[PDB]
RNA sequence: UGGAAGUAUAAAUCGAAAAGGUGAUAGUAUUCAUCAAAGUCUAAAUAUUACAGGAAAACUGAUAGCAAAGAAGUACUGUGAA
RNA sequence: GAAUAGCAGGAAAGCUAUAACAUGAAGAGAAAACGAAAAACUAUGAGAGUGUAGAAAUACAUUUAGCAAUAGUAUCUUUCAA
RNA sequence: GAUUCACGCAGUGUUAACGUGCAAAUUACUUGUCAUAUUUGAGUAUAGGGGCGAAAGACUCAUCGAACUAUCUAGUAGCUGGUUCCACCUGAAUAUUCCCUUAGGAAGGUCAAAGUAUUAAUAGUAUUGAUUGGUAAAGAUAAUGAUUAGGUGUAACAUCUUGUCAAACUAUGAAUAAACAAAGAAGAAUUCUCAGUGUUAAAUACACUUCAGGAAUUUAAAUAUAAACAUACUUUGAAUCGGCCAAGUCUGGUAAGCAGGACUGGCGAUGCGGGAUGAACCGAACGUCGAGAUAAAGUGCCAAA
RNA sequence: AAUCCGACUGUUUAAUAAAAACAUAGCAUUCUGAUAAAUCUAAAAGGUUCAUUACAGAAUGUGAUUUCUGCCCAGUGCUCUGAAUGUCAAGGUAAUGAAAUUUACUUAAGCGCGGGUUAACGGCGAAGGUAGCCAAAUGCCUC
RNA sequence: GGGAACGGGCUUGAUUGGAACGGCGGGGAAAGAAGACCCUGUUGAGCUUGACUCUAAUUUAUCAUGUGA
RNA sequence: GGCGGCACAUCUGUUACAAGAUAACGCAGGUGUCCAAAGAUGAACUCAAUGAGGACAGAAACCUCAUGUAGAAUAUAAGGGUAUAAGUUCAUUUGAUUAUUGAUUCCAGUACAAUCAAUAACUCUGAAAUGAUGGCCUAACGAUCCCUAAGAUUUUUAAUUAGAAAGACAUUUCUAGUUAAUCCUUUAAUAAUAAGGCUUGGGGUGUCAGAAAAGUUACCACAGGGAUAACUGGCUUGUGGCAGCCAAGCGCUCAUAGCGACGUUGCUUUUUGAUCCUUCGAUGUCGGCUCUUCCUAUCCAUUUCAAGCAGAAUUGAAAAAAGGUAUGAUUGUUCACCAUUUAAUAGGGAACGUGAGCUGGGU
RNA sequence: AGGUAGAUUACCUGACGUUCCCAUCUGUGUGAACAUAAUGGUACUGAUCAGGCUCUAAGCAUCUUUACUUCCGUGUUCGGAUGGGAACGGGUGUAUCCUACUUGAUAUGAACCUACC
């Protein structure tokens, strides 16, 4: 049974990181965060004002409003049997830019660098690039042969127990 | 006449007969709470266009 | 529990900042011809005994103190309600 | 009583008038409006499951319909009311 | 088929009555006091035509239309507060 | 207001008889009492929050810790019992909040029926990418705490080792998971033109404005799988919120077919084949049938092999 | 032959208790001068004790005889031939106000203070169980 | 045996000839009675008491105009 | 069930399972407060502890240097946070203020409450950027009705001067000066009291979404319940009972004739617990008398082996449950304890066998 | 090469010693005034006679620490699954995921703007 404080069962949630505690990065408050970005909410215990709730930790939300000191995020919580949005305004201190558009960015680049030679080379009349390939689940492997110049053979069997002690 | 207090057994088959229902596209859209001068700004071009817009109007 | 007197708060009615004095709240003397005095007085009469609950079983030991913080040069009075206190005190 | 600082009745005390009552927030003042209490009678339009005489019925049809379709408030019970 | 008043037919049935009122056409405010257009805007969206080809149905391009619904905007009424 | 016997009366014992009796309190024997505080008839008086009581809550017409009778009255009941034809289709529940609430209600979840929408309105799944967490494990001159011993230097203290630990210790930290993205101002992108506000020292930078708006060119591409009787729902409403079982789970307890939990599958609501028998185990879920290959599990007989 | 209870004659739970329970005589207490005390009644030149009058009427406790009834008036009752300005109602008086209203003063019993009372309720290390009695129909340990 | 944990019925066994007379008290968890013990109802009733709220009786004060001092 | 406790409103660590949720009368604790500073801001400084020095002065008084990641302090429970600070010292101050919005936590996406982000005023501190709408964070609290406080001059009207423009045979509008009234209502009109409205606080419900509430019934009653106690049965076996393993020692020497400590493994349902599965429209609730049957963990009799077995009397053990196992005083007693007798006067089960079998002493 | 402002916040720290300073920085002289305190020690201001003594910075070490990699070790643990084995306790096999401590090797900073050399 457990209390229904604010802050309830936060002893490791909210300790700071091993060597990590005091003041902040100053790229924390100096980062620009533009509506539509991706952030992380990450508590910040050792700023206690504007502390987001604790439900929201290490989520994944959205920029749709940008104030003089916080941030608006956006994110979804899950409640009975359906999905409610939810607007926080957080300081930056208490929030990370996210990665998970990381890998996606640069494919939208590289398709985009291949879509600008497209638009020169048909103005010289030559044959046109082909967009990148689509990103596969590992695929089976094909035939391949194994030259046996540098080959060496090491036996593989079941082995002789050996007591530890 | 002591009772059971609680369990979470089929609270999870429940609420997925029905699954977990998303909001809509206009719930991510709302505006309210946004901040006070790119409202007023964001006003003042809907009101000039809007203005523009109904000048033409009556001039056809 | 200790707040001095003369306070400097904002005036709503001077739209400044003016010199003010503080006191303490207290309920003012019930009258007699108020509508639910009245009403009251109404229903006790005649046989039937007590028609009104009497609340017998208080808890709280202490109340809110409420500061009557009146402005000196317009006499416009303000009503700041502090925390539950044992003893409070108006300071010099 | 819906009538709420008193709508109506009654009782104890008190108690008017060179008249006065009412206008439902108590009070006083000046206007305004409308009536003129504290005696009496009065047809018609209205009600009716007593009782009596009739007519009907998407009603019941002898365990139903009145308790009672025959000498039914009878036979029978109780000191009695029943 | 508000009471109600008439008609033929004799009728618990039927028909007829410039008609009180009920709900609605205007909404907010405790109330005094009031009382709604920029002859609207934006997005997606129902439908209608043509051309070509596969070729059996049908599949793409292109022109126009923009209702319902949803969301968001200006503008207007009342409120301390939309 | 002495002792006894008798006519009468009572009711001490048999804890006798009887106990669907002779009897809704009687019979037999034994016992007691058997005239002045005695016994008894008739008349009369006292009436239900009343009467009467040598007092037992006794008696008041087989009715008394408040008679009988009729009316209010078909009193109220969250409690017990019953609730009447067939086929077909869909098909639950024991969470959460509030209650003078705990045998009950209302909001809500699950469910049904009606009625819609061409529909920025698919996912109890995996993969790739960027994360979150502090559990299992691990550690123990790494911080806190516990703990055995041995060296070295100055019992003690330092210092180097050694053995063993923590639900309310932790540096580190999985597996399983949680929440993102993988192209919806409506499927991309580019070039030209470009306005209103504001930020700004000023802006041609920047922010929001259908990536204001407008015109050309290009274009259906951007993990796997599934999904049009898909998807999104709207309204109205029923029943239910006593649950119980299993376990490569946990806590209290010596333990329990004990009490209480996390995840999932079940029974309840469910028959069928098997475990001889069995609510829950195993196989597998059911319109009426025929022929075949099977599942669990079996092949001496009961019993098919 | 002893013990316990009730003194005795008597009465009692019709239908599971006949007794140690009730009554009793004896003892003791309280109120009352009759227009009273107790007490029935909605009321009443109404009713009962009462056709009565303290050797009486009304209300109680203990329960024959013998012996003895100890200490306590703090508390709760009851009582006083007592207390005024501690607290006390409606009223009455006065003031202000245009008036309702408001304010002030003065008022009975009761409670509070003081005295009496335990054959009143009661307690007995206000006073600390006296005289007696006992593993008691009263003593768990205890057979 | 398992099952609602004490079967007449179900599973596996033991076993069985139909109709019954006199006894008997093991069983039919035999009959009689919607348990009277216990608990729960937001169900009662008798009795008690400075439980809450009232009330008869009793009591005190004021008003209700006999004359002359 | 009662007595106890509050798991009833509430916070921290843990159980708790690395998202969220999350049980027990689970574990260790806490709240109904405290603060004109312990709120706001600026500046300066660095704490606990240790080492080495200095008259009294020493293990502890104060001074100096060095080391010192917080091992101190921060009102409090615990957990988090904090080092040119969030701690200490100094200084100024009252933002612990008014008004309007939109969100997050609890959540039914209700209220209260808490947590934020902004806007308009007026302020405080600082050189300034900023910071400040109480306390470093997570607890420190309260509806309807009723009572009681604070607020509604920012502006709108009317009358009369001065000026101006529209208005059928009067009257409105705009402009400046003035004077008066001004949050709404008490319904014929006004006035001063009185009362009622609107917005926001306080008074409070601790059973904390919030009745105004003492007992006893053995004289008891009703609707029900095996949702739930008193008896059997069932799971368990702590406790009761019985049986083993090892071998430190006891037994004159001698671990094991007979015992067996420190430990450790089982069996039984003949004790008492623990639970609440069956039974509340009833399974007659103790003992004794009577009678049958069953178990062996055997008391006697029969057959054996061992001894610290010379005989006698005994002691340990094996086969074996076909046969036996008594009379009485006290007690309702089961039990107990005495007096005998006997070959022995063993232990138990069968709904704690047995009440249409008795008895009714106990309850 | 040096100085100012930085961002990453130990590859940047801590201890032991070493190397220059030409500019720069630092240490350095003074107390009249702004200002400062018990103290011109700090902070403040005015200055330039001396100095690489310290600071700072660059390098040294079988340096503690910290940071990457291997190894530890597919060993701990774990998701799914029996009419699998065991009287229990606990522990397989299968399809999978797979730490930590330690140890060993390497490293002891990279990098942005402005000015001066």
């Known amino acids: 049974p457990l209390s229904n404080g604010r802050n309830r069962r936060t002893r490791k949630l909210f300790k700071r990181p091993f060597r990590g505690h005091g003041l902040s990065n100053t790229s924390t408050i100096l980062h620009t965060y533009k509506v539509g970005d991706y952030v992380t909410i990450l508590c910040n215990s050792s700023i206690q004002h504007g502390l987001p709730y604790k439900a929201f930790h290490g989520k994944t939300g959205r920029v749709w ?19 409610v949005v939810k607007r926080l305004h957080i300081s930056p201190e208490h929030i990370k830019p996210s990665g998970c558009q990381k890998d996606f960015l640069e494919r939208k680049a590289a398709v985009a660098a291949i879509r600008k030679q497209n638009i020169q080379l048909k103005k010289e009349g030559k044959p046109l690039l082909p967009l ?14 194994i030259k046996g110049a540098d080959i060496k053979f090491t036996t593989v069997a079941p082995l002789k127990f050996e007591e530890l002690y | 006449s002591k009772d059971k207090n609680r369990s979470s057994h089929n609270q999870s088959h429940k609420a997925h007969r029905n699954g977990f229902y998303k909001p809509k596209k206009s719930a991510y859209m709302s505006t309210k709470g946004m901040n006070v001068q790119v409202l007023k700004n964001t006003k003042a071009q809907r009101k000039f266009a809007l203005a523009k817009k109904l000048e033409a109007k009556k001039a056809a | ?51 009104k609950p009497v609340f017998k079983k ?28 044992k003893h409070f005190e108006l300071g010099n």
């Open chain 3, 58 to 85: 208080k808890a709280k030991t202490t109340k809110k103190v409420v500061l009557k913080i009146e402005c000196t040069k317009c006499k416009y009075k303000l009503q700041k309600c502090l925390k539950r206190c």
């Open chain 1, 132 to 145: 990148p390939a689509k990103r596969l689940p590992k695929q089976p492997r094909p035939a391949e042969l």
């Open chain 3, 1 to 51: 529990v200790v707040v001095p007197k003369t306070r400097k708060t904002y005036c709503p009615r001077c739209d400044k900042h003016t010199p003010h004095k503080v006191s303490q709240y207290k309920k003012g003397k019930d009258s007699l011809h108020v509508q639910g005095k009245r009403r009251y007085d109404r229903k006790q009469q005649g046989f039937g005994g007590q028609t």
């Open chain 1, 65 to 83: 409003n940008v104030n003089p000191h916080a941030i608006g995020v956006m994110v979804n919580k899950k409640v009975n049997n359906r999905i």
